[PDB]
């Protein structure tokens, strides 16, 4: 895994000073320094013929080096491409698969990937539309008992539960070609603002704990990656994964490093963290969590 503790991990005390010494504008500049870095890798597959129509945004391709390949087949008008990237987690290879919000023409590709990669948990951090901007297609049966067919794969809703900041849906995927069934849990975070970033990270971190527990429980009953997506699969996705990694390190060694985590993540899911606000949010969220845990003395 590219996500190892250090070199130069930072403690909460050191993190406080680092942020004080820099302020909001400082952290904003730090984000621009990262954004200025030339991506490490290439994007030839994502921009090649036949795969262009599979990208929601022409300006958000995925890296060749880490793309998730679909074990497709010969002469049947299709490629092995899906805009999705394997992403490491804290001391864990391929902890997540960061991908864009499925398009009607890639719903089948999305579910095939879920099947082949043995995914048990899917995390969606957007609504289908926000501010008039389309962000994700309705790729799963919304209500209990309804089902959708994608070739030799059938997806059925076994139940839905609405929480204050997220919705949990249990889905059963039936691969009729291999005569096997699997239950997948789908979580849709509902508290990410249409504009800016959450004013408090409490909801997102609690949600992170919900997802971690479900993954742990599913894996125990079955590690496969957790699919995490937002419209382009880089902003909210990158934020969710970066926080998960930093928090993990913080719980194990009491240290972390936002700059390293984001820079490292950007070598697997290109462009992870789309705005300075989101970058700043990663720092602020960690400090807010620190205070809530009674670790901060002002
Ligand atoms: C020129 C062009 C732009 C867009 C677009 O609107 N892009 C959006 C895509 C996007 C990205 C992130 C989000 C998000 F953060 F909300 P999420 O949480 O759902 O992930 C939503 C939507 C955008 O803002 N574009 C970004 C682009 C990101 C960086 N890319 C590049 O610039 C780039 C492209 C190719 C090669 C190289 I080297 C770099 C921007 N402009 O801020 C689409 C088609 C075309 Br043609």
Domain ranges of the chain: 1-298
CB burial of residue 241 (10 Å; 0-12, 13-18, 19+): buried
Question: With a 6 A CB cut-off, is 238 part of the ligand 1 pocket?
Answer: no
Task: Tell me if 233 is assigned to a ligand binding site.
Answer: yes
The CA distance from 146 to 151, in Å, is 16
The CA distance from 200 to 194, in Å, is 14
The CA distance from 229 to 82, in Å, is 13
Task: Tell me if 146 is assigned to a ligand binding site.
Answer: no
Q: What angle do CA 257, 261, 267 make, to 5 degrees?
A: 155
Q: What residue has token string 């599913």?
A: 218
CA of 60 from ligand 1 middle (Å) equals: 5
CB burial of residue 201 (10 Å; 0-12, 13-18, 19+): buried
Query: Which class in CATH covers the domain with range 1-298?
Result: alpha beta
CB burial of residue 11 (10 Å; 0-12, 13-18, 19+): middle
Out of 34, 43, 57, give the residue to mutate to test ligand 1, the one with the largest number of ligand atoms within 8 Å of its CB.
Answer: 57
CA of 94 from ligand 1 middle (Å) equals: 24
Contact 247, 261 (CB under 8 A): no
- Among 9, 30, 116, CA closest to 73: 116
Beta bridge partners of 98: 85, 228
CB burial of residue 219 (10 Å; 0-12, 13-18, 19+): middle
Task: Tell me if 248 is assigned to a ligand binding site.
Answer: no
Task: Tell me if 136 is assigned to a ligand binding site.
Answer: no
Provide the sign of the torsion angle of the four alpha carbons 129, 244, 14, 263, taken in this order.
Answer: negative
Question: With a 6 A CB cut-off, is 230 part of the ligand 1 pocket?
Answer: yes
Phi and psi of 242, rounded to 5°? Answer: -65, -40
The CA distance from 125 to 203, in Å, is 12
Cis peptide before 117 (omega within 30 of 0): no
Question: With a 6 A CB cut-off, is 196 part of the ligand 1 pocket?
Answer: no
Out of 46, 58, 60, 136, give the residue to mutate to test ligand 1, the one with the largest number of ligand atoms within 8 Å of its CB.
Answer: 60
CA of 88 from ligand 1 middle (Å) equals: 22
Nearest CA to ligand 1 atom 6: 57
SS3 of residue 276 by DSSP: helix
Provide the sign of the torsion angle of the four alpha carbons 114, 117, 123, 125, taken in this order.
Answer: negative
Phi and psi of 71, rounded to 5°? Answer: -80, 75
Nearest CA to ligand 1 atom 31: 59
The CA distance from 97 to 227, in Å, is 5
Method: X-ray
Nearest CA to ligand 1 atom 35: 59
β-strand 121-124 against 226-229: which pairing, if any?
parallel
DSSP label at residue 226: E
- Among 203, 224, 259, CA closest to 120: 224
- Among 112, 192, 200, CA closest to 151: 112
Task: Tell me if 21 is assigned to a ligand binding site.
Answer: no
The CA distance from 15 to 293, in Å, is 15
- Listing DSSP states for 30-85 in one string gives HHHHHHHSPPSS--HHHHSTTTGGG-S-TT----TTTBPPP---SSSS--S--SEE
The CA distance from 37 to 296, in Å, is 33
Question: With a 6 A CB cut-off, is 236 part of the ligand 1 pocket?
Answer: yes
Q: Roughly what angle, to the nearest 10 degrees, separates helices 276-292 and 235-253? A: 30
Contact 285, 204 (CB under 8 A): yes
CA of 56 from ligand 1 middle (Å) equals: 10
Provide the sign of the torsion angle of the four alpha carbons 258, 262, 264, 268, taken in this order.
Answer: positive
The CA distance from 56 to 102, in Å, is 8
């Amino acid at each position: 895994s590219v996500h190892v503790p250090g070199p130069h991990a930072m403690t909460i005390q050191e993190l406080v000073d680092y942020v004080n010494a820099r302020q909001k504008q400082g952290i904003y500049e730090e984000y621009e320094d990262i954004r200025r870095e030339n991506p490490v890798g290439t994007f030839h597959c994502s921009m090649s013929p036949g795969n262009l129509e599979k990208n929601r945004y022409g300006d958000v391709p995925c890296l060749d080096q880490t793309r998730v390949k679909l074990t497709k087949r010969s002469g049947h008008t299709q490629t092995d491409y899906i805009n999705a990237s394997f992403m490491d987690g804290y001391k864990q290879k391929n902890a997540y698969i960061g991908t864009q919000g499925p398009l009607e023409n890639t719903y089948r590709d999305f579910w095939l990937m879920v099947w082949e990669q043995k995914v048990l948990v899917i995390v969606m951090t957007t609504r289908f539309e926000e501010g008039g901007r389309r962000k994700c297609g309705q790729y799963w049966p919304l209500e209990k008992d309804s089902r959708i067919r994608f070739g030799f794969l059938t997806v059925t809703n076994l139940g839905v539960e609405n929480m204050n900041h997220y919705k949990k849906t249990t889905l059963e995927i039936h691969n009729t070609e291999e005569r096997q069934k699997r239950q997948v849990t789908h979580f849709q975070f509902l508290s990410w603002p249409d504009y800016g970033v959450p004013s408090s990270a409490a909801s997102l971190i609690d949600f992170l704990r919900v997802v971690r527990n479900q993954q742990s429980l599913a894996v125990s009953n079955m590690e496969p990656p957790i699919v995490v997506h937002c419209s382009a699969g880089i902003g909210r996705t990158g934020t969710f994964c970066s926080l998960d990694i930093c928090l993990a390190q913080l719980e194990e060694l009491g240290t972390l490093n936002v700059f390293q985590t984001v820079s490292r993540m950007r070598t697997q899911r290109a462009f992870s963290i789309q705005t300075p606000e989101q970058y700043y949010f990663c720092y602020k969220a960690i400090l807010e969590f620190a205070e809530k845990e009674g670790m901060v003395s002002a």
